């Protein structure tokens, strides 16, 4: 048997459509547990209600493993949502004003990517050299353009275009609102936030985990992922492409 | 005031308060007190509701101050309802408004001027004397007071008929002597044509004009009580007299 | 231990003052519209099924099955379905006003089913007396039935407010605003043990107060 | 015997309670006799009748019942004593969603008697009143007179030691009443003849009481034996009550 | 588009039955406890509110405050706080049984408060009569509280059942419980309008069936 934790959506979709049938061909009975809350999947992993979980990214594992002193490890990177800035009430970047509005995810680590991208736009400056994995409003050295940030739930970001000037879209909701996924004004080159499968550290060598890793690196899985998650930021194992 | 006819009837385990009220009719003349008498329940503890059409009968029709009532539309029936007064076996009142305010209530429905209501309540409260504790609530006073509240409530709107359901008979006879004196005056001055139910002979002999004696949803006799003497003819009537 | 005193007071004051303001307006306004329109509908439910003032078997059946559907259908899902209509009315999808709208729709249908109790429970014979004295149906309801069940209406509004408080926290995470929109920032995500105990304390004191107000007035108005 | 002793119920300056204050008062009732109680509603139809059960407590005074003080018992023993004493009430207070035959069974369920002796006593006291025919009927099948018999039957079932009435036949007819009172006289054949009762009227009292008391505003103005259906009142203001003849 | 929608639905066949099979356990089981302990709590509050049994002013006030504190305390936060205790008792925190425990906890207080309406609102006379008869408080609960008020209790049960259904959507997120999880799938993450309309219709049926059952029971009791 093998027990998986994912969030709902793209990572649980990877398990439901392709990886689950792949491991059953390989003799493993998979159980999927789906989460809508970030805290429960890791605890359940360290507590052994799960054998594995692909929802954690490199920054999140480090906070939660430190804070809760957990016996867990990453194992391999997985295809990850690009992040990108999109037209809202304003249609091109140059239109930005003192007091313009931007919609962004309320997640601490995805807020950290957003902050790193607005510094790459040069709209704000962050205190460069401060921890990137845990950046926040206080890590804004200067709100150069006095931008009015709007923290939201990520699935609301596609509808927010009408309400805010420009709207960062997580990328998990850009390609499901796929009709507008092409309209990105900016793109994310940061590799500090890659998604990463994870296990209890004692599990790291197990043949079942090697067969999960192989399923996650099988040619059938690559064919399925290219087809289902087009434009996602690949594992460095895939040459990041 | 006359019935054409009435009746109302119930199947086995249809089970309203009593078994059927039978084919029946009467004329109650103007300026006349008319009594109803007989063993308990029996549809007689209900029968008077049929006059105000508060139960619709299974049969027949009724005329009151000219108008036949059963044919009326509900909005016309309001004025018929307004001009005919009634009082009951239970006190049937608005808990969360005062005594004086319960007395004002029908007059609010009369649409009377504020001072006309105030005057009429002060009048009717004083006629029953209970002006002395009218700023009051039902836990504060007793059933005797509450009878006078019913009486005044019925009285105040100057209705052309009253349909008493043992309100003055409800008290014990010694207490009743001081109140019965009121109804006599009300009849003499306004020819109220007051109709009353009872299960006690004594009150009839000391108040009324004609008595229907009754059983099984039907008449035993109608008798004159004039001369303070009930001139009955049946042995059932004699038992009811005793 | 002083870590706890410092961590909260310096930062959180600035947000708390807004998070509170958003919370109160969202509960208050939604409650008003819920009690207002819910009253009228509750009356209709009763007076159609009363068979005394008026009757209609069919309208009664239709309105009940409607009310049933809307009372039980899930609120969060209904809010997502109501976003286009909401934006078209409010002029935007985001803020306490937009939440107050969807909250009020749930509260509207919530309210009326309660009041059904408040009427079926009441003593019969005074109704017959009102009919015996020939009042219009509108007068009966307006200037009798409320006062008779006055203590009953205070209880119902008290409990509805407490419900809408829990509902407002759920409404706020998706739409923005409210102490729920704080708690998810300092719990569920970036969880902090000391900040969570302060929000818990504020709730306790506020929710005693509203109920204690309700019980005092309801007691006065027997 | 019963002894009634300096009993009072003083209220507040507002005096917004059920009635006006009631004064320190005392009497003695015997094993062999029927006692009637009479005044105007100004004194209070309730009078101190609820306090006899100790639904209230004397602000002055005390209460011997069957020769035993009740204000001192002050325990589940006082409730147990209450179970043993008969009363009927101005308000029907019947359960609505059980048959009146099961409202008749309800007092014996309190006594905890074996259910067979419950069935027996029930049918006995129910057919003594003659309401056995309309016992199975719920309260939407009745008038006041049926409901009265129900209260009366409910009271009778224990063969209780001592008896209290509350202006019962104000809304009832003579031959049922006559027969009921003839049953109470048969209860005198049983251990006790004590039948305490309120009616402010004369008609009943003149017909069948042994003794009686005349009162206003919590003052007793005379007690009178009744003989040959005559009161023989000595009291002047009592004679204002006797004018009600 | 119609044929595309219809042909799609056939694919989800087994998953739908597994979501529904889950849902009955959460709602049914949690309801039982809610009605059970909520009864005792409401009764105990009421008897200490009255001179019947024993009148305890202080105990009454403290217990009343506790019920208000727990109803108004937020559901989602409470679930997250309950994690360590829930894990020790059930042997897990994932799944419908663990979630139903948390549902039921909220339900105890909500049901006791609902019970309180019905208890405080009875007509005095019969209580006064049995008390005059020297009856013990056990007999008073054994029949006297029930005889009429049991219809209002069917009403209370009916609203409670419908309430636990809405909360089951919210627990559906974390516990992966039944139709709440199903509505989180192909909802915010993906937009499949066809299965939304199907879920709406499936719920609509359940709603009508529940309230129709409640309505009939309450009608037949009096």
Author numbering:
A (entry chain E): 44 to 284
B (entry chain C): 2 to 243
C (entry chain A), E (entry chain B): 5 to 226
D (entry chain D): 1 to 245
List passages from the publication reporting this PDB structure:
Here, we show that NmMetQ is a lipoprotein (lipo-NmMetQ) that binds multiple methionine analogs and stimulates the ATPase activity of NmMetNI. The overall architecture of NmMetNI is similar to previously determined structures of EcMetNI, comprising two copies of each TMD and NBD, encoded by MetI and MetN, respectively. Each MetI subunit contains five transmembrane helices per monomer for a total of ten transmembrane helices per transporter. Using single-particle electron cryo-microscopy, we determined the structures of NmMetNI in the presence and absence of lipo-NmMetQ.
Reasoning that increasing the nucleotide concentration to above the Km for MgATP would promote complex formation, we mixed equimolar lipo-NmMetQ and NmMetQ in the presence of 5 mM ATP. Under these conditions, we were able to determine the single-particle cryo-EM structure of the complex to 6.4 Å resolution. Despite extensive efforts, we were unable to improve the resolution of this complex. Our model shows lipo-NmMetQ docked onto the NmMetI subunits and the NmMetN subunits in a closed dimer state. No clear density was seen for the lipid moiety of lipo-NmMetQ or ATP. A comparison between NmMetNI and EcMetNI in the outward-facing conformation in complex with their respective MetQ proteins reveals they have similar conformations, with RMSD of 2.2 Å over 1048 Cα atoms. In contrast to the inward-facing conformation, the NBD:NBD arrangement is similar for both EcMetNI and NmMetNI. Our structures show lipo-NmMetQ binds to the TMDs of NmMetNI, similar to what is observed with the well-characterized E. coli ABC methionine transporter system, EcMetQ:EcMetNI. Under these conditions the ATPase activity is low, showing that unliganded lipo-NmMetQ is not sufficient to stimulate NmMetNI activity. Given these findings, we conclude that NmMetNI ATPase activity is tightly coupled, requiring both L-methionine and lipo-NmMetQ for maximum stimulation.
